[PDB]
Design a protein around this ligand. Structure first.
Ligand SMILES: NC(=O)C1=CN([C@@H]2O[C@H](COP(=O)(O)OP(=O)(O)OC[C@H]3O[C@@H](n4cnc5c(N)ncnc54)[C@H](O)[C@@H]3O)[C@@H](O)[C@H]2O)C=CC1
Ligand SMILES: NC(=O)C1=CN([C@@H]2O[C@H](COP(=O)(O)OP(=O)(O)OC[C@H]3O[C@@H](n4cnc5c(N)ncnc54)[C@H](O)[C@@H]3O)[C@@H](O)[C@H]2O)C=CC1
Ligand SMILES: NC(=O)C1=CN([C@@H]2O[C@H](COP(=O)(O)OP(=O)(O)OC[C@H]3O[C@@H](n4cnc5c(N)ncnc54)[C@H](O)[C@@H]3O)[C@@H](O)[C@H]2O)C=CC1
Ligand SMILES: NC(=O)C1=CN([C@@H]2O[C@H](COP(=O)(O)OP(=O)(O)OC[C@H]3O[C@@H](n4cnc5c(N)ncnc54)[C@H](O)[C@@H]3O)[C@@H](O)[C@H]2O)C=CC1
Ligand SMILES: O[C@H]1[C@H](O)[C@@H](O)[C@H](O)[C@@H](O)[C@H]1O
Ligand SMILES: O[C@H]1[C@H](O)[C@@H](O)[C@H](O)[C@@H](O)[C@H]1O
Ligand SMILES: O[C@H]1[C@H](O)[C@@H](O)[C@H](O)[C@@H](O)[C@H]1O
Ligand SMILES: O[C@H]1[C@H](O)[C@@H](O)[C@H](O)[C@@H](O)[C@H]1O
Lengths: 337, 337, 337, 337
């Protein structure tokens, strides 16, 4: 009895999710796809020899009685809408970042779910399923290094397109950090300062690259997060956590050592795609399994997607300001703990 | 249209394969299990809420028209039989090591398959699917380090039971090495010497632990393989390959670094189970996908399982001998390249 | 014929310099000493079998004509006095940090040296002589990573004394990073800013530990240095330089690796005195050789000492004001390049 | 008052020892020299501004009473002669390897020293003074890993000369491992065995490269050492000791890490002369200090030199016979412990 899923947005990342659910994972199938380009979606269907149905809009897809859950994997803007609809049609929703582009949009979604009595919304922040980040979580829950104090993390890309803009650095990129970091330390943020180092020769005129983002939490944990998307050497994600009595750090992605031409080296990835492939699979499978076994979702909540929208706003504010912007959060609803 | 698989031997490792095919992988289901303990198998069926059928023997299971393929995952001895039967009943067979306990048993199986026109037998040497070993293969096929010359590998266990015996070191353990090594370098062995170092205090009286196994191939590649199954510190698999112009080495299993009490450390596994979990999943999935897409299997051939049986014999011979035993191989049949 | 050296201040560090100059290095000897505790000076001479005069003060010792260079290694606040005297006596001087406790104190010393025509003052910033830091310098000077953009570094101690106070973290501790960083990147500081994270249980109540000091050069390089003098795990110096096209990082001190009880570890030093023992040796040997083979000192200059003093002051400001303070330096007199 | 040292053999290595004793170390000077090329000896004295007598031979130089210790650093085969003379002249002698080219040559030197009552001979096996090897020793002496059982080690050169021949791999190259290994584990060798892998394209036709030398101590420790003098990638010394309850390994030389163009690398040395520069310095300084503070040399002994010679012979046997040769040592005269 496989979970029947409908995909809203046959994008490039929606093409991935369709393929893994189809050819890698267990206990689910894609039966409905809807795309703004109805000829683009119609190609994705013959591609993976799917046995699905193409809809012009989400309404018609959500109206289908086959679909039990939906993958909201289209443009960032077109999320908040598709989501609220799904909650009302009472389907399960896996929503890829962002939950909603506006901190208030995520607030509407919260209220809706709080009504439906249970949890339908899971946000696609995959890092939480990555074994690296999991080991960190494990170590922290065990008090291995006592109380966390500071966190040094980086997030680097070989290069970007002419479409990448200063705000995208804290919106499409630093977003995962913002998500997983607070999950790990179990703390809410508070302030976000932004500091622009000497600009890189690799970055385009309209872009501010690199950037540094300091972030304090209510507890007093200080996080400086480097964001450099034109580093050139590769795609690299670093995270070190200094504690009271010890330090734990995120591993490098497994590689074979090589001794040649006077150097002892490992390999650095070049494609953000390769870095977290395993995390997606574990992610979706948890979505499926959680629905079939518990009648609800389990991953990153809709509240977290809102914590994302707030924080990711104070950051874009400090990008122009240059001052210690504030992060203000509505109290956590009982519904979520 | 999922591949319908029958499991011969609801062992501990047969319990794993059933669970992954059921709850992790894609496009297949277990519909038949047979165990020598018909009450043991009957528990495995209610366990994973399977919708299968229990058979007293393989004949009755192989006679079932549901099953398309079989997992031969019972005692080592009870393999050769179950396999030859499956080849004759014309089912697909995934056979966990050993292919057959006797170098001639594997020879019977080869001949049968050579008749059935295509490939039905895939041997469960999972290391070939491990990304570490894959990266090595990749590097070698690219001539990164020119011509291989020597190989230094180790294989260590924290401890063993009173059931582990001197021959098991080269039969149940060094077997994977023997398999993957020749696959990597694309060469046939030739001689196997065995050298017993000072015996460990951790090993039991009847056991010779550790052991070292030198192995030459027709090309002139020298392999010294440490085998120490009472190392105590953990479960560790090492493999370094010296070439003409460089050296490549197998990575450690990903872990988080820790700075505490004057030491900078990573974690060493304690359970052989954890080391290759991913390799099994990729393995079985390849079995399934290969059958559905190509009408045959793809993994480690039955010939390789025979190359295993021969080599793993010369080793047990050098264990008593103390001399440079010989490895004699019947020419490779056209069927296999 | 060896360089005849007088030591002002025969404490713990003065004794170590006396010992290395006497039993390890080459081309120099101690002919004169003097300490505030004149009795303690007399013991040193016996302890080390010196052939030296024991003067009552620095004026007397500097008066001795058979001494041609002096080591100022006394109580911090006393340094400034002896250095001025030594310059006017026209002797070579190696002064441990601080050169002087105030920016003014340093200016008086610079202005005195510029008179005497050549370099007589070398400041004991030994990190410049450490093999790791030397390598970083070589890479940067070879444009290996293009233009430096950011710097992440840490300075950690297992614990401190009851006497250790909040301001000491920037005046005694961070002072080495302050010197080496701008030396490495050849850029002057423009601003500093202190950020306090959650206090550590390991730090006594009066001490503010850890700290985070953010510093910007004029060129736009953004440094962020972590000071944690109660980290427990050990004594640790980390430094990472992120450039345009690549990243370079300071090495760990050499250690054998251990595989035992589940961990794969290396050692971490506990005693700060073992970390740079080789840099001190090279530092002093350079003071000697550079004199007998150039007629002037070579290492860190009186001006560098001034830079340190100013920046140190700016940090103590930023400390107690939680503000972004400016680092205002007088024009670098061409006498220094 | 310094130790007055005469240098027999003023070649490349004799010059380096002359240089360190003159411009780096402490408590000694060169007062006499002599070379087969007497003209070359005269140049050294000018080159290094020595205050030394230039004798025509070792007899003359040993006759000089104002010299009290000598460095034998001449053409290998000449060593034995000078060492015997020096002993009978009752001077302290530091002899570079070999102590003598034959086991008999070494015996004559041992038998001469046992007469003169105390230790005058220290052999230049500098590895014992390397900080890495010193750490391994400390761990073993502290039973950190229990009883040593096996040893894997490698000795690699980028390339060699046209003059380098097959036997040199065990007499010149493997001779350092031969000395340090039995020193580390405090056990005597019992047998050796050579195994040749596929020749390397980098090795000229006349040379047999790489090689594998298997050695067993009396206690049962099984060493296996790889010699590859044409590895191309660099100069590399690796050593791993597998004990009962754990494993310890020699560190890489210190290097900064680099993240660039897809690789995460450290540096590998090319020049063998940079690998042990610190061990030489400590080695000679110990020859000096140990004399003026004990009245006898301390390091590797004439007996150790004998052990080396015997084992070296056994290897050249095992080389050309492809046999498992025995290592027969005379009883260790109690004069040596
Ligand atoms: N977490 C991660 O690492 C990644 C997730 N994403 C996220 O996924 C979303 C889109 O993925 P991408 O492939 O990168 O972009 P995409 O542009 O290829 O996906 C958008 C596609 O969906 C369709 N679409 C847009 N709005 C729609 C609507 N209201 N209804 C139906 N179809 C609609 C469009 O035709 C377009 O082809 C974005 O929100 C992005 O932030 C993107 C890349 C990676
Ligand atoms: N590659 C790997 O890492 C691993 C594979 N294995 C292999 O799997 C096989 C058994 O797995 P284990 O769980 O370790 O042992 P196991 O003893 O638990 O499995 C044997 C089970 O199958 C049943 N059985 C035996 N012969 C049978 C037959 N002819 N027909 C039906 N059922 C039969 C027995 O009742 C027993 O419960 C062995 O060949 C072993 O070498 C074992 C462990 C790991
Ligand atoms: N740059 C560097 O890496 C290092 C520099 N230092 C600094 O150097 C100074 C010396 O440190 P320690 O030797 O540990 O000091 P210490 O406290 O162990 O003893 C200093 C000695 O100098 C004597 N002294 C004080 N004032 C004097 C004067 N006007 N004339 C002559 N002698 C005088 C005192 O009697 C005392 O015996 C300290 O200020 C310290 O901060 C310390 C360690 C390293
Ligand atoms: N234990 C160790 O780590 C090392 C030891 N050695 C060994 O030490 C020896 C010296 O090497 P190099 O200095 O490179 O030699 P070299 O070839 O550069 O020159 C040796 C010099 O000694 C002179 N000489 C030869 N016979 C002599 C005699 N009977 N009396 C006085 N002088 C004589 C020669 O004229 C020549 O100038 C070699 O045999 C070498 O194998 C070499 C390097 C390191
Ligand atoms: O989808 C990925 C991912 O979100 C990473 O966090 C980001 O750095 C990559 O640039 C992006 O392409
Ligand atoms: O099943 C595993 C595996 O075959 C390993 O190769 C072996 O070393 C382990 O001991 C065994 O339990
Ligand atoms: O003298 C040293 C040095 O100043 C180091 O920078 C400091 O961290 C050590 O604790 C101190 O003892
Ligand atoms: O003198 C050294 C030393 O003997 C090393 O063992 C050898 O590998 C070097 O190549 C040689 O130059």
């Amino acid at each position: 009895m496989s979970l029947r899923i409908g995909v809203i947005g046959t994008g490039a990342i929606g093409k991935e999710h369709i393929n893994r659910i189809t050819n890698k994972l267990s206990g689910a199938e894609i039966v409905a796809v809807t795309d703004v380009n109805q000829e683009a979606a119609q190609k994705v269907v013959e591609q993976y020899q799917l046995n699905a149905t193409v809809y012009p809009n989400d309404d018609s897809l959500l109206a289908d009685e086959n679909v039990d859950a939906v993958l909201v994997t289209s443009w960032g803007p077109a999320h908040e809408s598709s989501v609220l609809k799904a909650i009302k049609a009472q389907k399960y929703v896996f929503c890829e970042k962002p939950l909603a582009t506006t901190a208030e949009g995520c607030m509407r979604i919260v209220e809706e779910e709080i009504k439906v009595g249970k949890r339908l919304v899971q946000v696609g922040f995959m890092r939480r399923y990555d074994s690296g980040y999991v080991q960190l979580k494990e170590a922290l829950d065990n008090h291995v290094i006592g109380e966390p104090l500071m966190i040094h993390c980086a997030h680097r890309n070989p290069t970007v397109g002419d479409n990448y803009t200063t705000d995208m650095a804290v919106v499409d990129t630093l977003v995962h950090e913002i998500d997983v970091l607070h999950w790990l330390v179990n703390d809410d943020y508070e302030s976000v300062q932004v500091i622009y180092p000497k600009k890189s020769k690799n970055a385009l005129p309209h872009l501010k690259d690199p950037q540094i983002v300091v972030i304090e939490t209510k507890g007093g944990i200080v996080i400086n997060a480097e964001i450099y998307v034109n580093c050139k050497y590769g795609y690299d994600i670093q995270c070190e956590i200094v504690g009271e009595d010890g330090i734990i750090k995120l591993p490098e992605p497994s590689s074979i050592s090589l001794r040649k031409e006077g150097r002892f080296s490992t390999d650095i990835l070049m494609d953000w795609q390769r870095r977290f492939v395993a995390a997606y699979d574990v992610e979706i499978q948890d979505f499926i399994d959680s629905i079939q076994k518990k009648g609800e979702v389990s991953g990153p909540t809709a509240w977290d997607g809102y914590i994302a929208a707030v924080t990711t706003d104070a950051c874009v504010k400090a990008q122009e300001s240059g001052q210690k912007e504030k992060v203000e959060l509505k109290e956590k609803p009982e519904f979520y703990q």
